A paper describes a structure:
Tryptophan-2,3-dioxygenase (TDO2) and indoleamine-2,3-dioxygenase (IDO1) are structurally distinct heme enzymes that catalyze the conversion of L-tryptophan to N-formyl-kynurenine, and play important roles in metabolism, inflammation, and tumor immune surveillance. Tryptophan-2,3-dioxygenase (TDO2) and indoleamine-2,3-dioxygenase 1 (IDO1) catalyze the same reaction: the conversion of L-tryptophan (Trp) to N-formyl-kynurenine (NFK). Both enzymes evolved to bind heme for substrate binding and catalysis but are structurally distinct: IDO1 is monomeric, while TDO2 is tetrameric with two independent TDO2 molecules contributing to each of its four active sites. The enzymes can adopt an inactive, heme-free (apo) state or an active, heme-containing (holo) state, with the balance between them varying dynamically according to biological conditions. While apo-TDO2 is catalytically inactive, the term “apo-TDO2 inhibitor” is used to describe compounds that bind to apo-TDO2, compete with heme binding and thus prevent the formation of enzymatically active holo-TDO2.
Two steps were essential for successful co-crystallization of apo-TDO. First, apo-TDO2 was expressed using an E. coli strain that is unable to synthesize heme. Second, the exosite binder AMT was added to apo-TDO2 because of its stabilizing effect as observed in DSF experiments. An exosite that binds both the substrate Trp and its α-methyl analog AMT has been identified previously in holo-TDO224.
Residue numbers in the entry:
A (entry chain C): 40 to 168, 185 to 338, 358 to 391
B (entry chain D): 40 to 168, 184 to 246, 250 to 337, 356 to 389
C (entry chain B): 40 to 169, 184 to 337, 358 to 391
D (entry chain A): 40 to 169, 185 to 338, 359 to 388
The structure:
Amino acid sequence: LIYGNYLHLEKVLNAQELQSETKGNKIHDEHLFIITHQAYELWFKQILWELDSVREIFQNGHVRDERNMLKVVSRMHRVSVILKLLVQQFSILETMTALDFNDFREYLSPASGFQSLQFRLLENKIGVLKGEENELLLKSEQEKTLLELVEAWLERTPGLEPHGFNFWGKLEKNITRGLEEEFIRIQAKEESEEKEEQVAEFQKQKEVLLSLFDEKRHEHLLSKGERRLSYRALQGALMIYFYREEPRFQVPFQLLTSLMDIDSLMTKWRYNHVCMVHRMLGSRYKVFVDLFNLSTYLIPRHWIPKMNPTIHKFLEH
Amino acid sequence: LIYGNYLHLEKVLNAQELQSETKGNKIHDEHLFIITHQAYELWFKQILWELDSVREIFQNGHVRDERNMLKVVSRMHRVSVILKLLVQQFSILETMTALDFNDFREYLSPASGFQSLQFRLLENKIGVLFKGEENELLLKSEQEKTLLELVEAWLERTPGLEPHGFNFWGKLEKNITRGLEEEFIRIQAKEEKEEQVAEFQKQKEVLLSLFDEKRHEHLLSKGERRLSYRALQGALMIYFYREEPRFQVPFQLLTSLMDIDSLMTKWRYNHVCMVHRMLGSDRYKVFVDLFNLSTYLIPRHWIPKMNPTIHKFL
Amino acid sequence: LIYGNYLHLEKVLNAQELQSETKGNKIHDEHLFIITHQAYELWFKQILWELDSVREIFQNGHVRDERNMLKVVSRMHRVSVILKLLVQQFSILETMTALDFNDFREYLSPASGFQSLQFRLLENKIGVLQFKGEENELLLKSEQEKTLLELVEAWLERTPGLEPHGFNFWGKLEKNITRGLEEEFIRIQAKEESEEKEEQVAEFQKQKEVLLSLFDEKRHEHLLSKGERRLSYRALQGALMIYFYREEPRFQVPFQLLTSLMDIDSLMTKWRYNHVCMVHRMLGRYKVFVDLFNLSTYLIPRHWIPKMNPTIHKFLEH
Amino acid sequence: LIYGNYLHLEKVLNAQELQSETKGNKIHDEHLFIITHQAYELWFKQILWELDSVREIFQNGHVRDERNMLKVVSRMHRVSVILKLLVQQFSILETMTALDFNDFREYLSPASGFQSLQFRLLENKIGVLQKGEENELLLKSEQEKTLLELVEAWLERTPGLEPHGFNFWGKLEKNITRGLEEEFIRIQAKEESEEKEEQVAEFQKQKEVLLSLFDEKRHEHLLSKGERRLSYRALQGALMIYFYREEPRFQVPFQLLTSLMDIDSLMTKWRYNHVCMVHRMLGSYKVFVDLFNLSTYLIPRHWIPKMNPTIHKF
Ligand SMILES: Clc1cccc(N[C@@H](Cc2ccccc2)c2ccc(Cl)nc2)c1
Ligand SMILES: Clc1cccc(N[C@@H](Cc2ccccc2)c2ccc(Cl)nc2)c1
Ligand SMILES: Clc1cccc(N[C@@H](Cc2ccccc2)c2ccc(Cl)nc2)c1
Ligand SMILES: Clc1cccc(N[C@@H](Cc2ccccc2)c2ccc(Cl)nc2)c1
Ligand SMILES: C[C@](N)(Cc1c[nH]c2ccccc12)C(=O)O
Ligand SMILES: C[C@](N)(Cc1c[nH]c2ccccc12)C(=O)O
Ligand SMILES: C[C@](N)(Cc1c[nH]c2ccccc12)C(=O)O
Ligand SMILES: C[C@](N)(Cc1c[nH]c2ccccc12)C(=O)O
């Protein structure tokens, strides 16, 4: 097949219409403003294509066969590699001065906000808090998000069962026993400024570590919007974090890592967008907050419940 | 106007047809192969748009008005910023395995070579030495004045080259020959230290070769050199007196022409690596003379000093 | 000279001491934490080296000889190229998990804040408003000596074309803006009494209030005192002169300088942003050149800019 | 512990001595030349730290416990992330002109070649074919087991290769020969045409390449000439991981083989950039070839032997 025909370059390379030229005098830098945003749209289509395919593996039940974990992780990694290029793409509009932008702003009247349908679809399908387009926007909100599909899959994490292993029970016992042992060590210290400072550190860290086990606090924060994943999904994600080296949890740990990567890359893009808007015109959204929050619970290695010989065979291929 | 209408997203976002899907079974990774090359094409259109505008400033005589030097240099810098992003873009196809590419390769049968019309137009318009009106557009790119030719013409008019008004080439030949003569007496010291006499003979052969107009006319004919002898003198004048206000922005232009040249090479290098990655870069740089002139190791003290009248002029 | 001796690799490659290894059990990922921060320090030394050299060109009066504008602009561009690499460098600590960082954190107890002496010196020398010893002498010198913002402010106050006797840029600008706004008010009043006219009447009143605020020296002196602005009123006039007449040969390279000062400023912000994200990842716009950003976004139509007289055009030509 | 003391900044920040300043007149741009190469050295020490730790997991037998595959893959991925930054680092020396480099070149006299001990150690420890205390470190890098050798040993133990068990090589040879026989008959059907001739040539070229995989004598010959580095048994093992990458036990080893090719091509991009830098200022063999070669054997999906239910569970 011919390169140009295969890539439909008759549509792609004939979609650049300068409003300054159509409404009188052409402004050279306006072509850059068209091309950058068209190139963002081509990459948003690729990100959407990969996102929906990963969503489909979860929805249609193929995620149950752990043979499909490679395809899930490699497509999410591809999404982060694309996002890194889109953040780098801002360097191109930075080659345009605001003084030059002012010469063609008037012909477009650009609003200082996210006006991309694909970016809104992307935000909705991940799990962010007219006419034919409105149907696509409604479907993005009604259908299962990546956050929901991941939450469902996390609730089935092996090792959580109270009969077998009882990860949450052993964790609560080891943390409370470790904090009790730490309190005694602090009390036995010589009464000094450092000893009083260590009581504050201990009391603060104890309040934080034990708050993990407060299901009522989590249910309250979930209602306020400050948390997104279920209490059972939090236990499942922590199981993957703590036992990441276990073969059945190695690739799911890479998945949880890339979901946090995509989340912070989405934030860097929005940050850059806001900077660009202020550069030209002048003067919470983390879907996987729980994954970032769970990754910063500072539990000492020795307090993590150990893997039994029978349990070690359970999380092995 | 509305974002999607302004960007004509009805054409842009409805140009993705997977040949695996049209000819039977869809292969997911084929969409990435379409999008990357369409995104390269959007940027090749922008690079062409900037390149032709800079070519126009030289062709229509606006380069004579030094007020336009900022616009020329900023658009060439923009071309290098876009090229750096296109070199970075190879990281996206690197997320596709060759094993996965093999699953959709039969539906397109990709040739191991540059098949872009815009890339060939870009190469031609800079100065690098398939059917219908595309062959006519390719012939216009070969017939019209290249950036190398337009820059060569402008370089021949560089101030300070006047045979008696400064006479840059005459003073340079005299100071270099006198400096090499003074170095030959200082080189001839004790026993052969032997490495210093050999290094002098090699460096003398290279430095003095600059003044051989017959050797340059020969290399120009063989294709090993692209700029005229007068243009070489003009570019060296800008290099040596880069600090002079009139030569500050033209020095930025000569540097960015070498930057775009080496970025064009990095892109072609990456393309060849990608082709070998999926299936079973030399000194052909348009501005070879600019790289060659920038590496002539003439000591700072040997450069002719700026005349009091010439210092006000430049 | 030998590569390793020239680069003093006997010091550089023997400066990596893992506190986990020193205090008992070694933790592999701790070496990464040392190397990345030592590499940031090497580049902070280079940025300081370039910054001080550019500061010296302004202090010793060499900036007056416009022959030195290339050296000033190329070193500031080099500073932004280095800053872009430092922002990219965050990708290396992102290869370390917070869970793995936790295994060596106890041995160092890293504070969640900027603890680099060189980064503080860099911030001070540029002109950032806002525990040591001996190093407190270097910190005091950074605070007492002229900042880049001050040196640039002084140089901006000397911009050609500002003089009321010759050209009078500020006078012509105020006249053309007020006359242009008066002509725009007539076009708004000459329009019907429709919703579009009233919507345009409010947009005109707001845009007129913004444009004319540029000429309020008392408002600027107040904002300067509150910290919301950093450059003098005369320096603002000088920077706008360079912005509007950037094409003029004598103003081409100074325009590149003003552009790179805004680039370094936003790159310094991206670095601090990334630092804060890294700290939250592991543990859980006060820009120096605000005025340059603010002046670049005053939406004045091209036709309202005062024209260059034939005698004045020859003045700004080298 | 204090930031500056912990990082030993007393050594790090007092290792910059400009030879221009020591030998008379200081040249400002010389400081950049020192800092960039010192920063490359800090990263070569980190790469070596990660590389040796991964070598140790293979040497001490910990690679046998597949629980350690995550730590092996994440440290190799970290090595490629560091290498990408070192390739990006060339942008810093590109802010220095050759004319400015010439003003300090005389004081150091830099040779146009790899003069780093750490880069040589890195090259040797990966497996690149080839002072007093430093010469001992260089000899240990050549005598000790390379990453290529340690990976080759581990690849020879890949499950599924055993002729008694799954017999991957036997089923592959049978399916390829039968598939090529079926393709030959399909080609020899339409009347002798240009398209038929194009199909006969493509078939004969692809048949010669596919069947060459089963020539152990050709591989033993190429291994002796240096054109190939991995043993014949290791090639079978790597192809087993490529073809059955989706199998849970082979998912992480596939990521490892992918990153070994990434590090390899990044090492090439670094050396390429080094050579370009040397030509910019003066003017003047991939360790895992077999992994790249195996990834480009164009075998149709349906010809790959199907996973036996006994082998799939293992
Ligand atoms: Cl192509 C186009 C058409 C109409 C508005 C925009 N606005 C930009 C923001 C922006 C505004 C002024 C100066 C620089 C940038 C924009 C970019 C991306 C998105 Cl998702 N929405 C919006 C762009
Ligand atoms: Cl979109 C399309 C359609 C048909 C052929 C190509 N060939 C690629 C090269 C390439 C070949 C195989 C695997 C990876 C890459 C190509 C890329 C860029 C250019 Cl200018 N020409 C050519 C691509
Ligand atoms: Cl090498 C070293 C020694 C002691 C403290 C820090 N703190 C880091 C911040 C940071 C803290 C925890 C996890 C990740 C990062 C830091 C980095 C840069 C600067 Cl200027 N100050 C501080 C680092
Ligand atoms: Cl720090 C130092 C001291 C002495 C020689 C080199 N040579 C550089 C190459 C190079 C040569 C001239 C101009 C630009 C670059 C070099 C860089 C990296 C390595 Cl591994 N070996 C060597 C550098
Ligand atoms: C059979 C299973 N894939 C089990 C499962 C669920 N979540 C997981 C997380 C990590 C590892 C395994 C799981 C499934 O139920 O989908
Ligand atoms: C007025 C002029 N631009 C002079 C000129 C020619 N080449 C140059 C290079 C550097 C500086 C100036 C020139 C012209 O004749 O076009
Ligand atoms: C002679 C002069 N260099 C003039 C000057 C000052 N600031 C400027 C900005 C742009 C152009 C020129 C200047 C001086 O007074 O420093
Ligand atoms: C037990 C084992 N790790 C088996 C092994 C060897 N090479 C492999 C490649 C992929 C998967 C497994 C292997 C060993 O013998 O090292």
